[PDB]
């Protein structure tokens, strides 16, 4: 009914449409994950909705929505409809890095968000897949 994973935000990278083309998306996502894996930006971002880089978060799946939730406060920081997630993936290399791509509602920018997960990052991909499929099923 609800799926809830402890994760840390690693930030985002801006993507182009050309990068999200079939045949190109899995290289693009692996690159973003590799790029952010050992990166750090210590700048506090006033405009990051409290779910930006380096934040401990609950990544939750409920009601066809991916939710980012403040763990101490339980505040809903971010709600992403699963239906408009363009792309998602899991770190390929030497795993617990999860990524998804969606358009930012306010800026119209395509962004790849990466999270370091406490669980196998494939548990998140697999849960999202079950929900995507149920949504496709109703076609």
Binding site for Hg ion (CB under 5 A): 4, 6, 28-29, 32, 58, 112, 132
Q: Cβ of residue 105: shortest distance to Hg ion, in angstroms? A: 18
Please, which residue, 24 or 40, has the CB nearer to Hg ion? 24
Please, which residue, 106 or 136, has the CB nearer to Hg ion? 136
Phi, psi of 115 (to 5 degrees): -130, 135
Residue nearest to Hg ion (CB): 132
Please, which residue, 106 or 138, has the CB nearer to Hg ion? 138
Contact (CB, 8 A) for 91 and 97: yes
Q: Cβ of residue 24: shortest distance to Hg ion, in angstroms? A: 10
DSSP state of 67: E
Q: Cβ of residue 32: shortest distance to Hg ion, in angstroms? A: 3
Phi, psi of 105 (to 5 degrees): -60, -40
- List the 76-81 sheet strands across, edge first: 76-81, 65-69, 56-62, 3-14, 110-117, 97-103, 87-90
Q: Where are the alpha helices (DSSP H) in the chain?
A: 25-37, 121-137
Please, which residue, 14 or 45, has the CB nearer to Hg ion? 14
Q: Cβ of residue 94: shortest distance to Hg ion, in angstroms? A: 19
């Amino acid at each position: 009914g609800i799926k809830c994973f402890a994760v840390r935000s690693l930030g985002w990278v801006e993507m182009t449409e050309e990068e999200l083309a079939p045949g190109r998306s899995s290289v693009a996502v692996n690159n973003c994950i590799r790029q952010l894996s050992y990166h750090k930006n210590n700048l506090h971002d006033p405009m990051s909705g409290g779910w930006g880089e380096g934040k401990d978060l609950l990544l939750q799946l409920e009601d066809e929505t991916l939710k980012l939730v403040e763990p101490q406060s339980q505040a809903l920081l971010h709600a992403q409809p699963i239906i408009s997630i363009r792309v998602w993936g899991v770190g390929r290399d030497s795993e617990r890095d999860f990524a998804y791509v969606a358009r930012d509602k306010l800026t119209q920018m395509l962004k790849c968000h990466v999270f370091r997960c406490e669980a196998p990052a494939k548990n998140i991909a697999t849960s999202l897949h079950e929900i995507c499929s149920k949504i496709m099923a109703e076609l």
